[PDB]
Every structure is written in structure tokens, then in C-alpha cells.
């Protein structure tokens, strides 16, 4: 029974790290990447916290678990993942793992502890269940201030980026790290196999870091991507609407957008420090050599691509793609360019830990790819499936299928679907859904999507077959 | 011996506009029907939204039972049609030998009245394919962007709010609906079978679009605006702030724009009163009127700048929740009913008139006892109405309101903020008393009445209600 450590980051993009030729020096994460299996085409299940984390820890899609929206936020109907879903936490506890959780669960108050984990520290550890949804009255007020031409301290916009006082040592990140260090120190004292999960606040927006992380990256020097700042042409209406108050970016100057990038880059540098501290503690405690490690970000985050901030009901790569490293100490490092999914984490843990079956696995174990490289999947369709069923009480029922060359997005709450040529338009600027030059690729993707919805028993297959009747 | 029944169903018609209600618009034809029938002056819709209200009206069950709990065919609702497993009063009446006819929009799925056995004579959704993509309001979005830039449409108007149409009454959709209604009455008078006719009028759905002389009949300069007009919402739920449909951004509206929204609406009500006169005079000419069992109703009201709101959205304010209702039974002397009654009470009333067969639960009650006896039919009973706003076009809110003659409590389980209004001292619902200790006893009473109602209708939200209201429970 191997020791397992999961380092789980909130809204961390795939692309920012130096090992991915990104703009931020990340030596600690690069070292882990180069020692483990790099999943360079990892895709989240949904660009939203609770749905992604329920998929990650259960191995099933939201229509099976019921966890298909964020919990405890205006205006979601949901409060918690059902205690009927034990997740890998209860399954690992059931076979003699000491499971520990640091940081926020995002799946209901007390959730890790109710499933048998030592919930060492975190926002939702001691909260009462069935709380009223958090309704962002203060954020609404503050975005109205920005629209009136006001700024916060030192000309900043604190719903986007903020210089925190004090030092790294004063941060929530430093606390999460210290509880992870304690978790590793305490596991080294035990005979029993351990399963540790550290769920980091960072880099959740707004981008809030102390000096020197706050000014490490000069906003003037930021390289803005080709889809930055553009007007959305022929895109679905859900990308326009102000779902969370800070989605009104009409007030953002180019300087505001560059600081959103530079402060985000500071947060990634601070995360790289935090990863180094935890890895060095595992090494000091003699746990690192045999440690089975997953580093993952639940989803990415928008920094003004398509003039979007944060996240919302859409499928763009900057949100859908996720960073993923899985380090098996028995295996030589490889880089996997075949697409993989958040639905593949629970099966991988299941194979590592011999977890007991608790129902369906909608994904697959990544051990064959980790051992053999991309040739494990020779002959198979290279696809990923993404869902955006809800955004905080807005129903959208979105489904995206992504091949290495194309993406088709079904928006059943709209009349406008999306079709992107990823080979010729990797920045997803031009919606080709109505372009007759793409009829063959669309027809192919529609068939692949029907096959995926059938495979996972998604009940929206019926509506899909109605909407796509021109192609069947 | 089965009676002839006619339903005149109007879209977003307020309770208060008519001259028989001491309102601003001269409505002699509707007044004559009110004076001949049973006035339900405290009628409440089930939801301030078309498809939910009409599924409640025609099934007699709440949308958690029927599944019809949002609009159909609109960005970004999940729904397309009322299940064919719900026959409604249409199939039920057909099954017992009524010739059922439908004129105008169904709003419950393409071909719906026809699939249930009605002659769907004419209407927007009569010949449409089913399972169509949701109508997504790209042009209204672009229009409101022009408004926000300071633009006006032709002649200074704002056509997402009010519009002078060219030509005459005779050129209008209203005139076409009336012509098909006249043919319906003429056809009924020639048949042996009892008839059940439903005319579902487009008017007065916003924007307020009428030809001359209705467009200028009521001078915008003379419009009396109410006490809750134009106010800043204080301590009100976040769902009232959000621009759900693009025309909900009224930041660009002048006081003149709001007065023309009223004056064009009043013109539409005058045009409706003409249309009602035409159909009633055809019923009289055909020898049907003396024995005709009539319901006149608006599916819900509509906001005209009260709490700075336009049209409708997920909220429970009286101008939306209240509906006009007149029920005329030719065997009964006229009465005014001030007890609250609900859209859930229409299907049971039809059931008692027509001896319709049982097709499951009735969540409301027949209004025949009130029509015969007056308000004292309900002596010793709590005077309450229940309202739900489960969805607004793909936005989930799960709202429930209970209204007594003196108080309203609104539960907003998508929010941290509930509403409590003192209707006796604050009938304009300006002040949210939810946190005011002086109202603790009334709030406790309303929370218990709401729990009782959710239990009665087997609403599965009662679990969450018991958590949110645990300080009571
Ligand atoms: O930790 S939380 O994600 O729960 O923090 C939330 C909230 O985060 C949200 O912000 C918007 C709305 O939903 C998404 C994002 O698009 C979610 O990340 C955060 O912004 C707010 O300030 O704190 C709450 C917790 O109270
Ligand atoms: O006759 S319809 O109601 O179907 O017309 C709709 C639309 O009406 C809607 O307008 C907003 C969105 O939901 C409510 C209201 O709040 C609904 O009445 C109408 O405005 C538009 O012009 O036409 C569509 C049908 O195509
Ligand atoms: Ca997240
Ligand atoms: Ca309506």
C-alpha cells in the first residue's frame, strides 16, 4: 500500500510553468514534472470548483453523483456532496489508510471528516452544514465603485489583483504548507500507509500576494496572447452575461489586465516556493523516495482571453486545460500528449492503492500511459469530454468534445454552438459552426459526442439527438 | 347539459388597470363581464412567468409535479414542452365529448393543443417542429446596447419598451386572434357537441406595441406613477439586481420612457377591451352568450418601474403576483370575492363545470362555492396564497412566497436574504422587514404557514426550508 500525496491547486492554469515554456520560473514544480509523468494535454471535467472536485474524488460525472454545480454560492441549489458518495477518502480509510486533508473541501462543511479523514485545518472544517448560499453583496458594491472610476489602495483593483501586507510567512499558503509539513512529520511516525491531500487556496482570484511576489513580474513586460482583449464574434450569449459581479470587466484598462497577469504570475512563483518546502520536508522525513504524488489544478482561469476574467459557462482551453503531474517512483519519466481527463484521477488512485469498487469509473487508470507512454493508446480516438451543466444556479447543459485538431461545443440553452479549428486557430477566436468548409469535421464530432454521452449514460443524449438531427 | 366554456387568456395583463377596479383605463366590455360574473379581486398567479403559470392553469398541479417549472424554448431554460403524459383540461374535456378549440400561443410546446385533441385553429406554435433550439435574444441585447449609448429608435421611442405600430387595429395580431375567435364561436353554434374554446391573446405582452389611435389614446404626460416607482431597492435580494433578460437593464430609461411604457400599456388594454367586446357580441349574435361559462384571466401581471423593475423576473411583488380574474356562471348572481384565490383554482373550477375526469391531484380548489356564497364560503379558514418562482429562463431560484391580506413572506433559498412585507402599512412593499424584531411574531406565523403549504403539495424543497428556517421550526 503506497504512500500518496495530492497537491491540489485552485484555478491554476496549464501553461504558466517554465517546464511548459511558460513565463514563470517554477524550479520546484519543473523538478517534479521531470521526475514524474507529465500529462501535458490534461483536461478538467468542468471549469468550476465543486463539479471538478466531485469528479476528481468520486471518479463519476455530476449526473451520477448529483454534484453538478458549486455548493453554498448564490444562486446554486446545492449545499454538499451526498454522504452516500464516500469518495476515494472513505474507500482509502476502509482498507487502513490514514487519510488527512488540509485546506478547503468545496464539497460541503465537515465533508473530509464525515468520510474518515483527519481534517487538520481548512475553511469548511468546523462550519455548520446547510448554510445559506454566500451572496456577493460586497463584490457587487466594489465592482460598482470600479465602474464609477474609483480604485482601491495604490491604484489597484482588489476584485482582480491586490498587494497583501506582510510576508509569505503571514499567508494562507504558508499555513497550508505548515499543516502539510506536520502531516508528513506525523505520517513518518506511523506504521500505516498515508493518503494526504493539500488543497491550496492559491491561485484563486483575485490575485492576492505579499511582496516580493506582488512586484516580481513587471506588468509592463507581460506578453499578452493573440485572443487577449478581443471582441467576441459569433459566440454564445452565456459568455456575455455578468454571472458573478466581477465578470463586468468594462472598467478594466490594459494596465489592469497586465496586473491581473503579473499578480497571477507572482502567485505561481509563491506556489512554486510552497511546493519546494513540502517536497524538502518529504525528503527530510524519508518519505519522498517512495511517495506517489499527484500535482493538479482543478481548472484554469481566464486573464482577458476573449475579454473574459476568472471563469464562467464556456469551454475555452485556458479554463478547460489543467496542469497535471503524476509521479510513480517505480517508473521512468515520460511526457503524455494523449488527452486525459479529471475523470482519470480516481481510477489511477484506485490502481495505486487497490481501492475497493464503489460503483462506476467514468474515466480510466493512467498507469498504462505512465508505463508505456502515448503508445498505450495507439489506435484509440484521442478525445476529451468536458461538461458545464451549471454555473452557480444558471443551468447551461454545455458539453464539449476536443480532439487534437478540433473542438465542438454544444450549448443546449442557446441556439449557437461553437466549432473551433485548434490546428489553424488554437486561440479559438473564430466560431466555424456555420462554415460549410467544416461540415465533415462537425459531423464527425457530433457522432463522437453522441458516443460519449451514450458511454456515460448522460440523459441529455435525447435532447442532443433532437438538436443534431441534421447530422444523424 | 355539459356547459359551453370560453377562456379569454391575456399575457402579462395586470390586475389593476381596468375601470371596474377604479384603474386608469376605460374598459366598458371587461367591466360588463365583471358586473355580470364573479369578480376575483384578490386572484394570485402561481408564478410570474408564462409557461409555469399556464401549465399550472391547464393541469391543476404545481410544476414540481408536472415537471413544467420554467419557460420553454427560451435562453437558457432546459425545457422544450409539457410532457404528453400531462393531457391537461384539453385532453380531459376531449375525452368526455367537448369540441376543444385553441386560438393563439400555447407556450407549452409546439403542436401541444393538437397533440391533446384540440382544434388548434391558429397560433405561433401550431405548425412549428418540436424540440427547437431556445430563442436567444441576440437582437434585444444589441438594441439595449444602443439604448445605453444614448440612442433612441424612430420618433424618440424605445422599441424594447414601447412602439407605435403602423396601420390600424384591423392589421394587428389582436384583430387576427379575434377573427379566429369569431370563427370558433360561429363553428360552435353549428355543432351538437358542447364546446370549450380558449383564446390566448399576445397582448398585453411587452414591449407595448399598438397602432394609432391606441398608441396615443392615453397621454404619457398625465400618467400617475405609484409610490414605489423609480426607487432604489433597499435590502432586497440580489436576484432583483441582475440583468436576466437584456431589457432588464433600465439604467438608460428616462421618466418619460417609463410614462410611455405606462401609456402604451394603457393603449393595449383599451385595444384588448375592444377585442373582448367583439368576441362577446359574436357570442350574443350566435345565441351562445346567455348560457356561456366564461373565464377572463391574465397569466401574471407586469412591472412598469415599481422598485425600478420592468417586465418580470424572479421576485414576488404584487404588481406581478396579482392577476385579473373574472369567472361568469350564467346560473349565479354576481358577487365580488375579496378572499385570495390562485391560478391552481382554475382547473378544479373547470372540472366542476364540465364534470372532467380525475387525472391525478388537484393542488387547488373549485371556486364554485365562493361564486355561489361569496367570501363567507371560506369563513374560519386562513386567507393565504402560495406563489413559486422555481426558475427564470434557466436561472434556478426556488423562490416561495406566502401572502396573507396583511403580510407577505418570501423565501429566497438561492440567497441569504429573505423578504418580509407589511402589506397593511407598506402595500408598495418598499421596506424589507425580515430583520426587524417588531415583526418576529408575524414572520414566525408566516414561516409555519409556508411549511404547512409545502407539506400539503409534497414540495421536495420542504427539507431545505426546515434547515433555513430552523430558528422557527
Ligand atoms: O472558495 S470559494 O471558491 O468558495 O470562494 C468563494 C468565491 O469563489 C467564487 O467566485 C466566483 C463565483 O464562483 C466561482 C468564481 O467564478 C468561485 O470560485 C470567492 O470569489 C468569494 O470571494 O469567496 C467565496 C467563499 O465565500
Ligand atoms: O411570446 S413569448 O413569451 O414566447 O415571447 C418571447 C419573449 O418573451 C419573453 O421575454 C422575456 C423573457 O422571458 C419572458 C420575459 O421576461 C418572456 O415573456 C419575447 O419578448 C420575445 O420578443 O419573443 C420571444 C419568443 O420568440
Ligand atoms: Ca477552482
Ligand atoms: Ca405571461
Nearest CA, atom 12, ligand 2: B245
Looking at the structure, tell me whether residues A256 and A159 fall in a common domain: yes
- List phi, psi (to 5°) of B295: -120, 125
Residue B74 Cβ inside 6 Å of ligand 2? The answer reads yes
Question: Which runs of consecutive H residues, i.e. helices, occur in A164-223?
Answer: 172-188
Inter-chain residue contact A395 with B76, CB threshold 8 Å? yes
Whether B242 has its CB under 8 Å from any CB of chain A: the answer is yes
Cell match 459569433: residue?
A234
Q: Tell me the nearest-neighbour CA distance from A118 into chain B, angstroms.
A: 27
- Check: CB of residue B349 under 8 Å from CB of residue B364: no
Looking at the structure, tell me whether residues A110 and A24 fall in a common domain: yes
Sheet with B195-200: strands ordered across:
B119-122, B99-104, B195-200, B5-10, B293-298, B325-328, B38-40, B335-337
Q: Which of B326, B358, B378 is the last residue of a domain?
A: B378
Q: How far apart are CA A117 and CA A86, in angstroms?
A: 11
Nearest CA, atom 21, ligand 1: A136
- Partners of B197 in the β-ladder: B6, B101
Inter-chain residue contact B396 with A397, CB threshold 8 Å? no
Listed residue (B395, B295, B410) closest to A76, CA to CA: B395
Sheet with A194-199: strands ordered across:
A118-121, A98-103, A194-199, A4-9, A292-297, A324-327, A37-39, A334-336
- Check: CB of residue B431 under 8 Å from CB of residue A427: no
Looking at chain B, which residue has its C-alpha nearest residue A393?
Answer: B396
- What CA–CA distances, in Å, run from B292 to A190, A321, B2, B368? 86, 65, 11, 15
- Check: CB of residue A68 under 8 Å from CB of residue A55: no
Length of chain B: 473
- List phi, psi (to 5°) of A331: -120, 150
Q: How far apart are CA B49 and CA B58, in angstroms?
A: 14
- Check: CB of residue B136 under 8 Å from CB of residue B101: no
Q: How far apart are CA B218 and CA B369, in angstroms?
A: 39
- Partners of A162 in the β-ladder: A208
- CB atoms under 10 Å from CB of A226, counted, come to 11
- List phi, psi (to 5°) of B303: -90, 140
Which domain CATH number covers B201?
Answer: 3.40.720.10
**Cell triple for B273:** 377591451
Looking at the structure, tell me whether residues B135 and B280 fall in a common domain: yes
Alpha carbon distance, N-terminus to C-terminus of chain B:
50
Q: Which of B317, B352, B378 is the last residue of a domain?
A: B378
- Which stretches does DSSP call E strand in A26-117? 37-39, 42-43, 98-103
Looking at the structure, tell me whether residues B166 and B53 fall in a common domain: yes
Nearest neighbour of A133 by CB, restricted to B135, B414, B467: B414
- For residue A283, what are the domain limits? 4-375
- List phi, psi (to 5°) of A100: -130, 145
Listed residue (A1, A2, A7, A3) closest to A345, CA to CA: A7
Listed residue (B288, B270, B269, B285) closest to B328, CA to CA: B288
Q: Which residues of A59-98 are buried (b: 16+ CB within 10 A; e: fewer)?
A: bbbbbbbebbbbbbbbbbbbbbbeeebbbbbbbbbeeebb
- CB atoms under 10 Å from CB of A375, counted, come to 11
Q: How far apart are CA B223 and CA A114, in angstroms?
A: 61
Looking at the structure, tell me whether residues B235 and B100 fall in a common domain: yes
- What CA–CA distances, in Å, run from B337 to B27, B30, B254? 20, 17, 38
Looking at the structure, tell me whether residues A160 and A183 fall in a common domain: yes
Q: Tell me the nearest-neighbour CA distance from A401 into chain B, angstroms.
A: 20
Q: How far apart are CA A322 and CA A341, in angstroms?
A: 9
- CB atoms under 10 Å from CB of B242, counted, come to 19
- Residues of chain A neighbouring B235 (CB-CB closer than 8 A): none
Q: Which of A325, A341, A375 is the last residue of a domain?
A: A375
CB neighbours of B274 closer than 8 A, spacing ≥ 6? B29, B169
- Check: CB of residue B364 under 8 Å from CB of residue B348: yes
The per-residue DSSP string of B329-357 comes to: -TTS--EEE-S-EEGGGHHHHHHHHHT--
Which domain CATH number covers A412?
Answer: 3.30.1120.10
What is the greatest pairwise CA distance in chain A? 65
Q: Give Cα B354 to chain centroid, integer Å.
A: 23
Looking at the structure, tell me whether residues B112 and B92 fall in a common domain: yes
Q: If DSSP codes are grouped into helix, strand and coil, which group holds residue A20?
A: helix
- Check: CB of residue A99 under 8 Å from CB of residue A134: no
Nearest neighbour of B76 by CB, restricted to A74, A396, A466: A396
Distance A236 CA to ligand 1 centre (A): 24
Q: Are strands B43-44 and B38-40 parallel, antiparallel or unpaired?
A: unpaired
Length of chain A: 472
- What CA–CA distances, in Å, run from B22 to A292, B13, B269? 78, 16, 14
Instruction: Convert A337-399 into a string of H (helix), E (strand) and C (coil).
Output: CCCEEHHHHHHHHHHHHCCCCCCCCCCCCCHHHHHHCHHHHCCCCCCEEEEEEEECCEEEEEE
Looking at the structure, tell me whether residues A75 and A202 fall in a common domain: yes
Cell match 471535467: residue?
A45
Q: How far apart are CA B264 and CA A224, in angstroms?
A: 50
- Under 8 Å CB pairs connecting chains A and B tally to 95
Whether A70 has its CB under 8 Å from any CB of chain B: the answer is no
Q: How far apart are CA B424 and CA B407, in angstroms?
A: 7
Cell match 426587524: residue?
B436
Please compute Rg for chain B using Cα positions: 21
Q: How far apart are CA A106 and CA A419, in angstroms?
A: 32
Ligand 1 is surrounded, with C-beta below 6 A, by A 49, 70, 73, 104, 134, 244, 310-311, 392
Q: How far apart are CA B446 and CA A245, in angstroms?
A: 32
Looking at the structure, tell me whether residues A456 and A325 fall in a common domain: no
Please compute Rg for chain A using Cα positions: 21
**Cell triple for A379:** 489506435
Listed residue (B41, B48, B40) closest to B388, CA to CA: B48
**Cell triple for A429:** 477566436
**Cell triple for A388:** 458545464
Q: How far apart are CA B271 and CA B214, in angstroms?
A: 7
Q: How far apart are CA B226 and CA B14, in angstroms?
A: 14
Write the Ramachandran bin of B307: left for phi over 0, alpha for psi from -120 to 50, otherwise beta. Answer: left
Q: Which helix (H) or strand (E) holds B184?
A: helix B173-188
Inter-chain residue contact B238 with A415, CB threshold 8 Å? no
Q: How far apart are CA A100 and CA B308, in angstroms?
A: 51
Whether A465 has its CB under 8 Å from any CB of chain B: the answer is no
- Check: CB of residue B314 under 8 Å from CB of residue B239: yes
Which residue numbers come right before each break in chain A (C to N over 2.5 Å)?
A: none
- Check: CB of residue A175 under 8 Å from CB of residue A202: no
What is the greatest pairwise CA distance in chain B? 65
Interface test with A, best of B143, B394, B418 (most A CBs within 10 A): B394
Q: How far apart are CA A462 and CA A459, in angstroms?
A: 7
Cell match 369578480: residue?
B39
- Residues of chain A neighbouring B238 (CB-CB closer than 8 A): 74-75, 135-137, 140
Question: Which runs of consecutive H residues, i.e. helices, occur in B37-95?
Answer: 50-59, 63-66, 88-95
- This structure's resolution (Å) is 1.7
Helix (H), strand (E) counts: chain A: 13, 18
Q: How far apart are CA B192 and CA B188, in angstroms?
A: 8
- What CA–CA distances, in Å, run from B126 to A75, B53, B71, B136? 35, 20, 17, 20
Q: Say how many domains are in chain A.
A: 2
Assigned domain for B473 exists: no
- Partners of B43 in the β-ladder: B341
Looking at the structure, tell me whether residues B345 and B411 fall in a common domain: no
Q: Give Cα A28 to chain centroid, integer Å.
A: 20
Dihedral sign for Cα A57, A63, A69, A75, please: negative
- Check: CB of residue A417 under 8 Å from CB of residue A410: yes
Q: Which residues of A230-262 are buried (b: 16+ CB within 10 A; e: fewer)?
A: eeeeebbbbbebebbbbbbbebbeeebbbbbbb
- What CA–CA distances, in Å, run from B437 to B333, B433, B467? 46, 8, 21
Inter-chain residue contact B136 with A397, CB threshold 8 Å? no
Helix (H), strand (E) counts: chain B: 14, 18
Looking at the structure, tell me whether residues A328 and A399 fall in a common domain: no
Q: Tell me the angle at which helices B346-354 and B50-59 cross, rounded to the nearest 10 degrees.
A: 30
Tell me, what DSSP letter sits at residue A469? G
Interface test with A, best of B72, B76, B131 (most A CBs within 10 A): B76
- CB atoms under 10 Å from CB of B333, counted, come to 10
Q: Give Cα A97 to chain centroid, integer Å.
A: 26
Q: If DSSP codes are grouped into helix, strand and coil, which group holds residue A145?
A: helix
Looking at the structure, tell me whether residues B272 and B421 fall in a common domain: no
Q: Which helix (H) or strand (E) holds B386?
A: strand B385-392
Q: How far apart are CA B47 and CA B321, in angstroms?
A: 7
Dihedral sign for Cα B176, B177, B179, B183, please: positive
Amino acid at each position: 500500500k503506497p504512500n500518496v500525496l495530492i497537491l491540489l491547486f485552485d484555478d491554476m492554469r496549464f501553461d504558466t510553468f517554465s517546464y511548459r515554456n511558460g513565463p514563470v520560473s517554477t524550479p520546484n514544480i519543473d523538478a517534479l514534472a521531470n521526475e514524474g509523468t507529465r500529462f501535458d494535454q490534461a483536461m478538467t471535467s468542468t471549469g468550476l470548483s465543486s463539479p471538478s472536485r466531485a469528479a476528481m474524488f468520486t471518479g463519476r460525472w455530476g449526473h451520477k453523483t448529483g454534484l453538478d454545480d458549486n455548493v453554498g454560492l448564490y444562486h446554486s441549489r446545492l449545499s454538499e456532496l451526498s454522504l452516500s458518495e464516500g469518495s476515494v477518502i472513505k474507500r482509502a480509510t476502509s482498507i487502513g489508510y490514514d487519510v488527512s486533508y488540509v485546506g478547503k473541501w468545496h464539497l460541503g462543511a465537515q465533508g473530509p471528516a464525515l468520510r474518515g479523514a483527519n481534517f487538520m485545518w481548512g475553511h469548511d472544517k468546523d462550519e455548520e452544514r446547510n448554510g445559506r448560499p454566500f451572496t456577493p453583496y460586497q463584490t457587487q458594491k466594489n465592482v460598482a465603485r470600479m465602474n464609477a472610476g474609483e480604485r482601491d489602495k495604490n491604484g489597484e483593483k482588489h476584485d482582480y489583483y491586490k498587494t497583501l501586507p506582510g510576508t509569505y510567512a503571514d499567508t494562507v499558503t504558508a499555513k497550508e504548507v505548515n499543516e502539510g509539513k506536520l502531516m508528513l512529520q506525523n505520517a513518518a511516525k506511523s506504521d500505516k500507509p498515508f493518503f494526504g491531500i493539500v488543497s491550496f487556496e492559491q491561485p484563486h482570484p483575485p490575485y492576492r500576494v505579499p511582496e516580493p511576489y506582488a512586484s516580481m513580474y513587471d506588468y509592463k513586460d507581460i506578453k499578452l496572447p493573440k485572443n487577449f482583449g478581443i471582441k467576441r464574434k459569433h459566440k454564445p450569449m452565456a459568455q456575455d452575461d455578468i454571472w458573478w459581479p466581477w465578470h463586468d470587466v468594462s472598467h478594466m484598462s490594459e494596465t489592469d489586465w497586465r496586473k491581473a497577469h503579473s499578480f497571477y504570475y507572482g502567485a505561481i512563483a509563491m506556489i512554486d516556493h510552497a511546493v519546494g518546502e513540502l517536497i524538502n520536508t518529504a525528503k527530510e522525513e524519508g518519505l519522498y523516495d517512495d511517495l506517489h504524488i499527484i500535482l493538479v489544478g482543478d481548472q484554469g482561469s481566464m486573464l482577458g482571453e476573449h475579454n473574459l476574467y476568472d471563469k464562467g459557462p464556456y469551454a475555452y482551453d485556458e479554463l478547460m486545460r489543467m496542469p497535471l503531474i503524476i509521479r510513480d517512483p517505480s517508473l521512468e519519466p515520460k511526457i503524455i500528449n494523449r488527452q486525459v481527463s479529471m475523470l482519470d484521477i480516481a481510477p489511477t488512485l484506485r490502481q495505486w492503492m487497490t481501492l475497493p469498487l464503489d460503483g462506476d469509473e467514468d474515466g480510466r487508470s493512467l498507469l498504462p500511459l505512465m508505463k508505456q507512454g502515448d503508445s498505450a493508446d495507439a489506435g484509440k480516438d484521442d478525445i476529451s469530454l468536458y461538461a458545464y451543466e451549471w454555473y452557480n444556479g444558471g443551468w447551461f447543459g454545455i458539453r464539449a468534445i476536443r480532439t487534437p485538431e478540433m473542438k465542438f461545443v454544444w450549448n443546449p440553452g442557446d441556439s449557437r454552438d461553437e466549432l473551433y479549428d485548434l490546428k489553424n486557430d488554437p486561440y479559438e477566436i473564430t466560431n466555424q459552426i456555420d462554415n460549410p468548409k467544416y461540415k465533415k469535421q462537425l459531423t464527425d464530432l457530433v457522432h463522437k459526442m453522441a458516443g460519449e454521452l451514450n458511454r456515460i449514460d448522460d440523459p441529455s443524449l435525447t435532447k442532443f439527438n433532437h438538436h443534431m438531427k441534421a447530422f444523424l
